[PDB]
Enzyme design. Sequence first.
Site, PDB file in Angstrom:
ATOM      1  N   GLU A 200      -6.173   5.669  14.429  1.00 39.78           N
ATOM      2  CA  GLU A 200      -5.379   4.801  15.266  1.00 39.78           C
ATOM      3  C   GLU A 200      -4.334   5.519  16.409  1.00 39.78           C
ATOM      4  OE1 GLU A 200      -4.747   0.946  12.465  1.00 39.78           O
ATOM      5  OE2 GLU A 200      -2.931   1.883  12.766  1.00 39.78           O
TER       6      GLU A 200
ATOM      7  N   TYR B 129       1.986  -8.626   5.611  1.00 42.51           N
ATOM      8  CA  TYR B 129       1.808  -9.142   6.876  1.00 42.51           C
ATOM      9  C   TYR B 129       2.431 -10.199   7.382  1.00 42.51           C
ATOM     10  CZ  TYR B 129      -1.658  -5.156   8.097  1.00 42.51           C
ATOM     11  OH  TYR B 129      -2.458  -4.071   8.363  1.00 42.51           O
TER      12      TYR B 129
ATOM     13  N   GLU C  10      15.392 -11.823  34.925  1.00 46.45           N
ATOM     14  CA  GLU C  10      16.431 -11.143  35.340  1.00 46.45           C
ATOM     15  C   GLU C  10      16.868 -10.056  34.450  1.00 46.45           C
ATOM     16  OE1 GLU C  10      18.489 -15.691  35.881  1.00 46.45           O
ATOM     17  OE2 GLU C  10      19.605 -14.102  36.637  1.00 46.45           O
TER      18      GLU C  10
HETATM   19  N1  GTP Z   1       2.532  -6.446  12.159  1.00 46.51           N
HETATM   20  C1  GTP Z   1       1.362  -6.626  12.002  1.00 46.51           C
HETATM   21  N2  GTP Z   1       0.448  -5.654  12.064  1.00 46.51           N
HETATM   22  C2  GTP Z   1      -0.792  -6.016  11.673  1.00 46.51           C
HETATM   23  C3  GTP Z   1      -1.400  -7.129  11.723  1.00 46.51           C
HETATM   24  N3  GTP Z   1      -2.872  -7.146  11.297  1.00 46.51           N
HETATM   25  C4  GTP Z   1      -3.123  -5.730  11.686  1.00 46.51           C
HETATM   26  N4  GTP Z   1      -1.744  -5.040  12.023  1.00 46.51           N
HETATM   27  C5  GTP Z   1      -1.627  -3.371  12.100  1.00 46.51           C
HETATM   28  O1  GTP Z   1      -2.653  -3.292  13.188  1.00 46.51           O
HETATM   29  C6  GTP Z   1      -3.499  -2.202  13.248  1.00 46.51           C
HETATM   30  C7  GTP Z   1      -4.732  -2.505  12.949  1.00 46.51           C
HETATM   31  O2  GTP Z   1      -5.209  -3.275  14.106  1.00 46.51           O
HETATM   32  P1  GTP Z   1      -6.024  -4.896  13.901  1.00 46.51           P
HETATM   33  O3  GTP Z   1      -5.065  -6.036  14.336  1.00 46.51           O
HETATM   34  O4  GTP Z   1      -6.479  -5.203  12.447  1.00 46.51           O
HETATM   35  O5  GTP Z   1      -7.405  -4.429  14.692  1.00 46.51           O
HETATM   36  P2  GTP Z   1      -8.242  -5.467  15.551  1.00 46.51           P
HETATM   37  O6  GTP Z   1      -7.707  -5.756  16.860  1.00 46.51           O
HETATM   38  O7  GTP Z   1      -8.781  -6.975  14.871  1.00 46.51           O
HETATM   39  O8  GTP Z   1      -9.669  -4.483  15.562  1.00 46.51           O
HETATM   40  P3  GTP Z   1     -10.874  -4.554  14.882  1.00 46.51           P
HETATM   41  O9  GTP Z   1     -10.881  -5.261  13.678  1.00 46.51           O
HETATM   42  O10 GTP Z   1     -11.365  -2.938  14.721  1.00 46.51           O
HETATM   43  O11 GTP Z   1     -11.924  -5.165  15.851  1.00 46.51           O
HETATM   44  C8  GTP Z   1      -2.616  -1.436  12.135  1.00 46.51           C
HETATM   45  O12 GTP Z   1      -1.384  -0.631  12.788  1.00 46.51           O
HETATM   46  C9  GTP Z   1      -2.366  -2.755  11.167  1.00 46.51           C
HETATM   47  O13 GTP Z   1      -0.872  -2.288  10.554  1.00 46.51           O
HETATM   48  C10 GTP Z   1      -0.549  -8.419  11.400  1.00 46.51           C
HETATM   49  O14 GTP Z   1      -0.879  -9.564  10.940  1.00 46.51           O
HETATM   50  N5  GTP Z   1       0.917  -8.010  11.404  1.00 46.51           N
END
Ligand code: GTP
Lengths: 440, 427
Positions: free
Chosen positions: A183, A224, A254
């Site tokens: 990450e 989530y 603004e």
């Molecule tokens: N707040 C929040 N964070 C999320 C959610 N889903 C994933 N994350 C965060 O996003 C990161 C992982 O990214 P993902 O959104 O699962 O990745 P993606 O864009 O789908 O990428 P790939 O599945 O690898 O193609 C981590 O930091 C997770 O904690 C969500 O619904 N809410």
Amino acid sequence: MRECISIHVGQAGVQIGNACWELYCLEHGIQPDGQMPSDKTIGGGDDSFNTFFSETGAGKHVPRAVFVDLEPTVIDEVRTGTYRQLFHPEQLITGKEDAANNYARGHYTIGKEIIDLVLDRIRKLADQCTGLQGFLVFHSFGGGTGSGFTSLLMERLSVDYGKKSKLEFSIYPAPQVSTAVVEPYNSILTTHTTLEHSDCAFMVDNEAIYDICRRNLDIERPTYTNLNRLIGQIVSSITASLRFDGALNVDLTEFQTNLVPYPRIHFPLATYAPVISAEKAYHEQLSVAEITNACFEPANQMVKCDPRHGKYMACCLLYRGDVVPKDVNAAIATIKTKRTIQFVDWCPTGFKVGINYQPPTVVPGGDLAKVQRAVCMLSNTTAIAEAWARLDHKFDLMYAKRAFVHWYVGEGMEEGEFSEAREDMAALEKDYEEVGVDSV
Amino acid sequence: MREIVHIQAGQCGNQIGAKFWEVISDEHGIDPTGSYHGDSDLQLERINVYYNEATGNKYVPRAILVDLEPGTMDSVRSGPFGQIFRPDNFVFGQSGAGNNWAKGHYTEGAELVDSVLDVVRKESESCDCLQGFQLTHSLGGGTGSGMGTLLISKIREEYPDRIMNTFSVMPSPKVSDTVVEPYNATLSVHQLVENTDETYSIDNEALYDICFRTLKLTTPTYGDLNHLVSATMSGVTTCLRFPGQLNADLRKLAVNMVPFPRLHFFMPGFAPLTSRGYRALTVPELTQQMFDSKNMMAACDPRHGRYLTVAAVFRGRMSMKEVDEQMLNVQNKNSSYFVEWIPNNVKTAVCDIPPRGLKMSATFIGNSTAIQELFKRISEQFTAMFRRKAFLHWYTGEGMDEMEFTEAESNMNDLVSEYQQYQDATA
Ligand SMILES: Nc1nc2c(ncn2[C@@H]2O[C@H](COP(=O)(O)OP(=O)(O)OP(=O)(O)O)[C@@H](O)[C@H]2O)c(=O)[nH]1
Ligand SMILES: CC[C@H](C)[C@H](NC(=O)[C@@]1(C)CCCN1C)C(=O)N(C)[C@H](C[C@@H](OC(C)=O)c1nc(C(=O)N[C@@H](Cc2ccc(N)cc2)C[C@H](C)C(=O)O)cs1)C(C)C
Ligand SMILES: Nc1nc2c(ncn2[C@@H]2O[C@H](COP(=O)(O)OP(=O)(O)O)[C@@H](O)[C@H]2O)c(=O)[nH]1
Ligand SMILES: [Ca+2]
Ligand SMILES: [Ca+2]
Ligand SMILES: [Mg+2]
Ligand SMILES: [Mg+2]
Ligand SMILES: [Mg+2]
């Protein structure tokens, strides 16, 4: 006129979009089938909600939104869910294989195959706008789609739309809900590539949201679902300026004018008040002064950093509900005389205020208490650079030993893209230090 | 010299421009339809200075309404008097200027400016003898600021021989929180110094402080501020609208008020100061008040400078002997505050018709060197951001260069230096 297209990229981006769109419907009186009895202008109108919703001859209010993920499973839940009738099938775009938490796969490998299809659908939505203002991009920093595909899409949107506004809501990584060890690489890669292509970016530290849910809402292990419900509220506060009209309503542009002193310094800190449980809110109403003061409480921030150890470059207060100028003016005056806010010597110490009379709505089966009034503060603090530093330290630890870099190199990337991205991050950290120095 | 063409640009310009026509329409006995219903023929003797008479003896204001957004003008059209204004004279855009002088002057304003000038041209044709132009606007926004000054420059090219006069609203951090306002204001002053004959410096700081400290309004609104602006506008234009000897035309006013061509920024004053919600003032009270710091429409202490020239207008039924007595008493009691090298620099007018709800009023117009204080203020705020080049991308993204900013900064600093020159000048 002044339509905004929302783009929901990857799981984070899509799931937040679900929460956001669910909440906008509730605020405007839009049924899960897209019908709005409150709207007398059938087939279309010039109403403030029309910046976010298009209208069909039938009377369906359709979100000006595209949902993209390189895999079907997350978007499939939208297609089947409560709001399946809200969206046209063409607005929901899936691939078959995801980016496997790899920037290079989302940007290049997998992403190159779906990019033109995404652009076509954005173009289709763009063509229905009488006066497109710009885009709102929802994505995570950590995922391969969220990082690489957003980068690629941003670059392509700059080419295709020119300097038409591109705003982002970026999910900042936190160990408690972190999906991948890589990450920090994906975060630095996307930040570098997107820096030039974004006009304003609202970061959401998943750890900060996690802590609020645990502390303020008394939730053991937040999901989530819980997180997205709280983000839904912050996003709604920032877009309310665009979706509603009023005398005291100040437009998001603004606020941006005041929030962006230099193009690279476009990361505002979001602070929301009140975040309270139904139990804790019963027989306790919080005043304009109470909710305002809560904005200068680090516990209510969307990003974990200390603005009390930094310097302000702007303060914007976005009020929602039963709020009158007299009280806002008095609350600001108090904070000012209380001298708790140190500002850079080069800028005016004013607080830019907006107010929408429509109060915050709550999603049924929520943790959040329905309050009479709420506030969202957007500040430009040198403290936001702490987030850059933490992410930059993690990157440094790994890239020294070239840990996991082969996964990126094998997908077509060079070590040179890593070092160049990191040097941009050092430059940005230096830029945030420079703006904080008093003038000679 | 006879007809004045009025132009109102942007949100502030159109709001104050609207309030102006509402006030003087009632004064001249013109109803929201345009029909005359007055008691005196003093109301029509000089009506043609501001109004075009139309078929069926209906009076149309010689007003042009400009904006880069429909908003304000729509509320002006929806307003009480919106019906008086010629609908062909509503010239607007859809974009907005986004509180950016560069947008109003070079990019967005550039697209609308010729449509305004066609309306300016048409109005100028229906003039037996055009005097000049009047403009209402704020210096802190984008439209009135950027577009307003570009309109002045373009009007000056086509009408170089006519008088250009403005009612310019100066920004205050007590009224507005838009950071870029000192930039827009400095860019606009540079333009006003070169291209106007007379500017009434209407300061939002002074209007706010009057509302708070004197009218005891806890939470003043724009309409509260505009109430003092409409009173000031009604008073400073009296001599142009009613029969009289002193300053009855824009040119005669300029010759009496402007000793040096760049030193044409007037500090307006007013007595009694009122809020929109009995007790008449004596001629001595009107005189003490109009010359008092607390009654100035610009946040400057007149006692910190010297008056180069003064125009005093008394409205209502009073003693011309006592007016003369009190006016001479004021000059003779404070002779150090009036430059000795401009003999008999205070000129007085008395008009029989008072404003609405007042038995008697007094409007002051002063060319005091103390106006440098207002310019030092906008300059302090501008330099603080400009020395770190903060918020410039908003301007350079519109094609402007740092050079324009350095030039504007210099001209205003030079203007402050000039006002000091004549403050320290002796006979
Ligand atoms: N707040 C929040 N964070 C999320 C959610 N889903 C994933 N994350 C965060 O996003 C990161 C992982 O990214 P993902 O959104 O699962 O990745 P993606 O864009 O789908 O990428 P790939 O599945 O690898 O193609 C981590 O930091 C997770 O904690 C969500 O619904 N809410
Ligand atoms: C919660 C923020 C409030 C609204 C705002 N506060 C601020 O800007 C503060 C004081 C807060 C932080 C520092 N900053 C300088 C404020 O009081 N102002 C910007 C006021 C103006 C504001 O005041 C209130 C109390 O609403 C407004 N007044 C009007 C108003 O007069 N509306 C009238 C119509 C109008 C509309 C726009 C324009 N440009 C002109 C006129 C209608 C009303 C009924 C009337 O006639 O007064 C609208 S917003 C100015 C004068 C200091
Ligand atoms: N006195 C007064 N000041 C106003 C009014 N409207 C705007 N302003 C001020 O004008 C500045 C903003 O300019 P504005 O006219 O709104 O922008 P423009 O439409 O781009 O020309 C700020 O200093 C405001 O406080 C008004 O009605 N009266
Ligand atoms: Ca409609
Ligand atoms: Ca254009
Ligand atoms: Mg995924
Ligand atoms: Mg405006
Ligand atoms: Mg005094």
